[PDB]
Every structure is written in C-alpha cells, then in structure tokens.
Amino acid sequence: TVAVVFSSSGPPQAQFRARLTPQSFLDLPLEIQPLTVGVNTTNPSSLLTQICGLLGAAHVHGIVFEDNVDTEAVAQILDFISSQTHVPILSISGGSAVVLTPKEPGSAFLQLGVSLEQQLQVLFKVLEEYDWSAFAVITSLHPGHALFLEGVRAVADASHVSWRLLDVVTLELGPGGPRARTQRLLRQLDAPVFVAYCSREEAEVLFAEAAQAGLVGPGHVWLVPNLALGSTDAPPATFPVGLISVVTESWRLSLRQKVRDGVAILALGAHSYWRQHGTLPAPAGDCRVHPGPVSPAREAFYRHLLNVTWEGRDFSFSPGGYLVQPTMVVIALNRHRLWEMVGRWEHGVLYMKYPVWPRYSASLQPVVDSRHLTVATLE
Amino acid sequence: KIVNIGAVLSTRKHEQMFREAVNQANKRHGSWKIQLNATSVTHKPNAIQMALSVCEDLISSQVYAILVSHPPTPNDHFTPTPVSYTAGFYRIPVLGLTTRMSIYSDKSIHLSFLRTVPPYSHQSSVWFEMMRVYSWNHIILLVSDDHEGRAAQKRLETLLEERESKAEKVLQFDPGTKNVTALLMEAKELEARVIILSASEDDAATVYRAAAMLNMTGSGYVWLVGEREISGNALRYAPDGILGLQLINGKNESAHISDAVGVVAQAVHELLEKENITDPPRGCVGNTNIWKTGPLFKRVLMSSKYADGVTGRVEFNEDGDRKFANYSIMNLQNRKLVQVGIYNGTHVIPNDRKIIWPGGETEKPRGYQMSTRLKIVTIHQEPFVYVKPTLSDGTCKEEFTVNGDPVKKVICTGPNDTSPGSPRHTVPQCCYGFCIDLLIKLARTMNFTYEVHLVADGKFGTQERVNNSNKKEWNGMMGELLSGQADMIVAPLTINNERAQYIEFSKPFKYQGLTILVKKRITGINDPRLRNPSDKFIYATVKQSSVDIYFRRQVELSTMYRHMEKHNYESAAEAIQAVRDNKLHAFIWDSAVLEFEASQKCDLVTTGELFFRSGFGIGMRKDSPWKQNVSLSILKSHENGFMEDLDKTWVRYQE
Ligand SMILES: *[C@@H]1O[C@H](CO)[C@@H](O[C@@H]2O[C@H](CO)[C@@H](O[C@@H]3O[C@H](CO)[C@@H](O)[C@H](O)[C@@H]3O)[C@H](O)[C@H]2NC(C)=O)[C@H](O)[C@H]1NC(C)=O
Ligand SMILES: *[C@@H]1O[C@H](CO)[C@@H](O)[C@H](O)[C@H]1NC(C)=O
C-alpha cells in the first residue's frame, strides 16, 4: 500500500478522486492499492496526528508527499517522522523539495532536488560559453549563505578559466532595516554580470532597490538559483527581463503527473527488491510506542530503493536525500513576462537556443552591440 | 501586559527552583510596568508525545521563549530535538541549557536555537593554545568519522593552515568497532610523538586497550584528550599521565537556569520597547503562520550582554553558541585526577603543580623521535638501476668487475614480477648499478641506513585529474613519495617546473637532454612527417612520462601528441623491442639512456643532438633535514673526481 497527502492549494477533491481511482494503473509490475489523505492546514500537530493515524491504522509500506504554498521549515518535520518510525517517504514538489544536507543519521527522506553545487556548476557552464567572467556576487543574510559562499569559491577553482572575481557583498535585505545603507552599497558597483542568492521576499526587495539605483538596464545580467523566483507560474513586478535561473526537469508538468511518478518509483523499488528476495517488507508504524533499533531488513530495502530507471528518466539518489545526475533546463524571462526555456543540460554538455544573448531595452526594440560582428566562412 | 515564558525541565524539583528564581528576578528587575510569568512541563520519553506536549504547552500560553534541559537518560542527542523542531516553525526562540553537540550550531536546520554552554567542537582552541605553549609542531590527529567527529577536525585544520602548520596524517575510524589496531599500526611508523584523541567514551576505551597492547604509551609519547573521552568506561583503561580538560559548571543545571532567566528577562524589555508588541500564536492548530517579530527578538537576544551571573558574564557568538568559556586542565596521576592548570579566555596558566608524563619523566618530552631508517623507492632503468633475480640460496650472485673488483649490490623487494597480470607477489630481487653505487656512497658518508623497494605502478610519475573530481592527484613514484610510502627517490628523475612546486630537489649529478631513436630527416624544430601525421611513422612515447606532459603543453606538438595518444608504451624495454624489430617508428627520450642503448645495442642510431636541457636529481619531501647534507655531498663528489671514474666504469665501457 502507498499513501498520498496533499496540501494548501485549490481544493483537489476531483484530483484526489482521480488519484484514488486507478487502483490498478498498470504503471509497474504489480500495483499496491493506493489511498489518499488530505490535511486542511499545515501545522506540527496537524501533520503529526494525520500521518501517525494513517500509518498506524493502515499498515502502509511507503508514503508519498505533495507540497504546499512553499513555506520553509516543513521538511524537517518529515525528516523527524521518517527517522522515528522508519517509514520511507518521498517529497515531490514545492518548498518541501528543498535539499536538506545534514539529514538525520537513520532517516530515509529522499527529496527530489538539486544541491547548490550542481546548480552553481550549471551556472558557471553558461558563464563560460558566453565568456563573461565578471563575478559580482551578492548574498543576503540567509541561513544558508555561508554554504553558497563556500561553494562558489570551491567551484571557481574547479575550472580552466581564471574567473577573475570582482566583489562579494552581504546586506540586510530583511523586512526591517536601514534602506539608506543598502542604497549606498548598491550605488557603488561595476560589473556586467551579477549572481544573487536570497529569498523571494528578499529577491523582490533587492530587485526593487536595484531598479531604484539604476542597475537593471540593458547593460547588466542577473543570475539566481532556484531558491528564489517562487511559484514559477506568477512572476511578480520589479523582476528584470532576462533573469536566468536553473530548474530541474518536470518544471511544467501537472500535479497529477508528478504523483504518478512518485508511485511509479516506489513500485519499481519494491519490484526490484522483489526479484532479489520475493517479498515486500512488513510495515513498522507504532508512532505511540516509538520502538526500533537499527533494523537490517528495512535498511536493505532502503539501500535497494536508491537506484531506479523507467520511462527513459534516470533517478539516482545520492546517500544524502537528493538525486544526482539530473537533466537541468535553464529558463529565462521573455520580453512579455513569461518563463521560457533557453538551454538544456544533459551529461555535462550545455546547449543554448540563442548563439548570442538577446539584449532588450526599456521600450524593447532589441539593441545590438556596436563592437560585435558576425563572421562567415567555410572549410 | 503579562509576558509568559516556558521551560522543559527534568525532575520537577528544578521547576520549583526555577519558579523561585524567576520570581526573584521579577522582584529585582522591572519598574512596575511589565510582569513576567512562568510555566513548565516535565520531559517524557516518547519524542512524538514530547512534541504533542510541546504545542499543548504552546497553546496553553503566549510563550515567548523555551528553556530545555536533559533528562537522566544518557541519550543526549535526540532529547532536545523535538522542542527545537516544533518551536522553530513559528521562530519562537528556544535556549538549550546544558546541551553539548556539534550539530545544533548549523543555523540552517535548527532554525532558532541558542546555547549557554559551548559545544564539543570548541575544544580544539585549548589544544592549539597549549600546543603553542609547549612548542610542539609535529601532530597526529585521531578523530571519529561521525558528524560530531568531523567538526573539530575542520576548525583545528583551519587554525593550523592559518599558521600553515599542515598537521601530519589524520586518522579516521568507524565509531563502534573492534580491532582498531590497524590504524595504530599505520600511525606508529610515523615520526610525531603527540597524538590527539576525540571520540565517544566507548571508543576511547578500545583505543586505550589497543594502545596498551601495542605499547604506544611508552615513555616520550604524550596524550591529550577531550572531556567526553576520560569519564565512563574509558577511565578504567585510560593510560596513566594523560592531559585532559573539563568544564567548570558542567551538569550543574542550577546556575544555568538562573542566568538564562536573567538574560531572557533583560531581553524582554528591549523587545517590548520597539513598538512590535505583536503576540506569538496561541494554538498549535490555530495559525499556520510564523511569528511576525521572531527574528527581531532572536537578533536582540543574541547581542544581549549580561552583567554578571553565577558562571560570570555571558555573551553569544554569531553562530549562536556561547563564547568565552574557560576550562580546567586535567591530569591522571596514580589513578587519581589532579588539576594542573586553568584555561583563561585565550591563554592557559599553570597553577603550582607538576605534570607526570606517561613515562614518569620530569622534563617536557620533546616530540619527533628522529629517524635514521628511511625507505627509498626506485625504478628499473638500463644503465642506472639494474635488477636481477636472486640466487637459489637467497643471496645475490657473486660477480666481479673486469678490473678485479667486487660489484656492490643490495637486496630489493618490489613488484609482482609480472607486469600484466598478478594480484600480489612481492618476491625480493637483486639490485645494482651506477645510481645504486652513488646511493651506497651517500649512505656511508651520512650514517643513515636504507631499505630499497621498487615502485608499484611502474610509472615515472605524472599529475592526473581523477574522474568526477577536480582535485588533481599524483600517480606513480610521485604519489608514492607524497603519500608517505617513501622518504627519498634515488633514480633518474628529471627536474622541471611541475615537480619543483611540491618537492625540494638537489643539485644535478648528471646533465642530459632529449634525442630520438631511429633504426640504422627527423629534425627537432618541426618535421612535416611529424607535424602532419602519416600512416606508417608513429611518433609516440611511454605513457605517464615527462615528455607526454611536455607535448601536451605545446600547440603543434599538441597535434602530434593527439596523434600519439593512440599509442602509449609502459616501459623502455617495450619501446626498444618494438623499434628493434621495425614495429615502432619514432621514440624520443633522454640522451644518456638512448646513447647507452645505441652503444650497447648496435644497428640503432640516435638522430640529432640534445635539443633540450635538463638534469637528474634526488627527490625528497619539502622541508626535509637531509637536503642540504645531500646537496653538499654531491657537490663535493663532483669536485673530488668520483663521478668521473664511476661513469667510466658504468656509463661507457670503452666503446
Ligand atoms: C502566570 O500568569 C497567569 C495569570 O492568569 C497564570 O498562568 C496560569 O497558570 C496555571 C498554572 O500553571 C495554568 O493552569 C493550567 O491549567 C491546565 C488546564 O486547566 C492544567 O492542565 C495545567 O496543569 C495548569 O494547571 C493556566 O493555564 C495559566 N493561565 C494563563 C492564562 O497563563 C499564573 O498565575 C502565572 N504563572 C504561570 C506559571 O502560569
Ligand atoms: C541498483 O541497481 C541494480 C540493477 O537493477 C539493482 O540490482 C540493485 O538492487 C540496485 N541497488 C543497489 C544498492 O545495488
């Protein structure tokens, strides 16, 4: 059996029925009976009670999560629960699909996302091809800013080009603080390429401030990881046109499609383990008792659960609860305020739709660099 | 208003003292404007039931902060986790009273957590201080492989790299294991005589037993451990006379309540005077939103400097941990612990006591027992290092020089004796040659003793980038020397830029260049047959050599090396055999070896003069005591004339 949980959207009663309906979807050899659960609000006791009750009155083997309005500090509860009751879970979307690096020792979380190292690698593989090498790094006072600042330096020494760094700055971009100081610091900068790391509210504040202090015209280029930019389906105001981010595959699928992948990966994991030993491990769901030392059977099942492949999509989870070797796709903000694909990435080679970077102006009418020319030839 | 605080306490007798202390602080503080309020709950064993009780408490009041402590259960890891997880959802600050673990200070997971006691990872500071104090610079690090184990190493390595000390080999062991002997056997061969232990109390006992079994606790050896490695099962098996440390007010749980209450009561006034009186959520179900003023309260809480508590002034660090905590150095004399020194904020002050080192000595035991035995690596070459099978009895065959003189030989272990396929067969062989004679003279003239062993890989040595990594690694004789498997390289090693950055060489003892081998117009600048690859002639050399890197550093010779990459040999003998039977076309290498081969093996002629200049040298690790000695000995040998007769004996047999 496999459980499914929704959160914080338009009431998916029709979606819940459509997910519960295919009791035999023929998506894998053998199909455990699926069941659905829905929480009204996201809260500690609400979540704890719902999961403990469902997994104690259902005897479930695996459970698949579905995210919410993308608020932080929610994946920690899932890690806590999985570590306590030794049930493998899986996060699929939203803010709960943000990589948690130092997870609990005996936990089995397996949240599908990409660590900052891979995103930075992809970004520097697009900086090298257009040959910018400016490196104006801006980071807010965020919990994970030290990791980003270490990672950028680590990757900078892992390439051929010199990557002459210009300046790194840290500013208080929170809800409350002195705007004049940040205005003064932003007003003094000179670099054609910026890399920024902050939260969505921090992103909007920083972009509004940059628009105030004239750093958003056709002269500069901005780059951000997937942590910012929020919903991906509603770009707010003051977001510069030409923003570049890197998101994983399946950034445009449906909620129902994602759950179909979640149940498929659990089903193949059981089927792959079935060929080895011809069984399905019994559930261990005593939330009230909370027993259990290290168990070898569940450990072996989790070890066999790591690698999976189906429908021509390689899902390989690292020991840390994040997948390794995905096929990221770069996206950018078109001239009409709409996210669009720019360049794929597949086994370490980058592609682009445009041989040169389109540069737009305040009144559009794409400007062309005066000191750039095209040369024709043949062999 | 009536601001309210909460707390989780152990035995509910601490709760009465907590209430009395908070009432006393209410009496002392405040100008009859704001009153503080108290409520507490006892710790229960189930973590999930713990969290349920926590937001039962959270609904029970507009809690402004939480104080958490440990129960009598020794499992100190998971107990203060659930309260942090629950109270971090709404950014309600929580303060840990007497928790010492190194995973709670990662301010990305536990979102709002403070400590009134420094963690275990801060122990490396006193190690560094007392390490400078006693003038020790040769260090062995020995820490467990867990996350807590891997945190002290990072900070100590940061300090030592800041001083560019570059501590010697650090050893990692899996926690909860038996037969830990292998790591200690690997470490005992090293030179440093001070080792640092940091692990769980159980692993300390087995490490102590292994050290006693292997007699690593003999005189001269000096130990120094942490607070968690002395008490418990480890105290019974602990070797006598080892330095240790402890915290002054550890596990008191009475002063910590007081000063935590004091600092919280000091911070609440500064919070409320900021027009941000917005109340915390009342209900663990009611509101799915964070506190609107939690980050501000945490920020003003961290920078709140208290005046004077029972444990003194308290002030927090940018990562949230408590700073400026001062320990008590401990020593073990006759199975009775006695204090020998007191840590200050930065320095360490001894206090009218004498240390008893494990050997019972009275003076400061200097480390680094100097070594006269040192291992020497070598590679097989034709006119420098001959290798031959040993005699049937076990010794070497007794030979003589043509001029009526013995030939000096040594016994050499080494490889599988079969390059292509063999798992492991290290049968000793017999070595002799010109380079070996130089080694014998050097050994005689400086009192040291050698143990010559051949190379494993068989490659001269190059730098390569391992797959799925950018950290370059040295492969071959270079890697063997850098790792520590060798102490000197006595072999025809070429001196160049790529090696001088990590090796201190010696003055050259023989100059040589680069020629080409042709069986009997291949110029040196550029041949169109070489510049433009052909079908018959192949211009390639043995892989992992220096000429390979030299051609990979070129532009048109880069194209030549791209053509060559399909062909790469493994030894000089292979190339000689291939070019002798017309199977090979071109081969470029050193002038001396090629000239010797042409003089010995007829019908083969070298093309062109030495179009390059270089030299051979003895290779050693950077900052080694023997370098100056060896360089002056080589220069004196050059001036004496020894090299002349030696070369007349070996390099040219009057051809
Ligand atoms: C703080 O000021 C308020 C003034 O109203 C008082 O707090 C009250 O303290 C009592 C005793 O801890 C709480 O009673 C509790 O009731 C529940 C359910 O009835 C029971 O299960 C508990 O064992 C406990 O007895 C009461 O809820 C609480 N009320 C408020 C509004 O805080 C009290 O006088 C002052 N001191 C403390 C410690 O609260
Ligand atoms: C990895 O994939 C192989 C190939 O199907 C499978 O047999 C194995 O169980 C998977 N897991 C591990 C840990 O090898």
Ligand SMILES: *[C@@H]1O[C@H](CO)[C@@H](O)[C@H](O)[C@H]1NC(C)=O
């Ligand atoms: C612990 O603290 C109390 C009060 O702060 C103090 O009186 C006592 O000396 C300390 N040590 C012990 C062992 O109780």
Ligand SMILES: *[C@@H]1O[C@H](CO)[C@@H](O)[C@H](O)[C@H]1NC(C)=O
């Ligand atoms: C250690 O604590 C403080 C920190 O400097 C200091 O005032 C005190 O005298 C030291 N010694 C003891 C025994 O507390």
Ligand SMILES: *[C@@H]1O[C@H](CO)[C@@H](O)[C@H](O)[C@H]1NC(C)=O
């Ligand atoms: C190297 O030279 C020094 C100084 O002349 C002398 O002690 C000896 O010859 C060598 N020293 C060592 C430690 O090998």
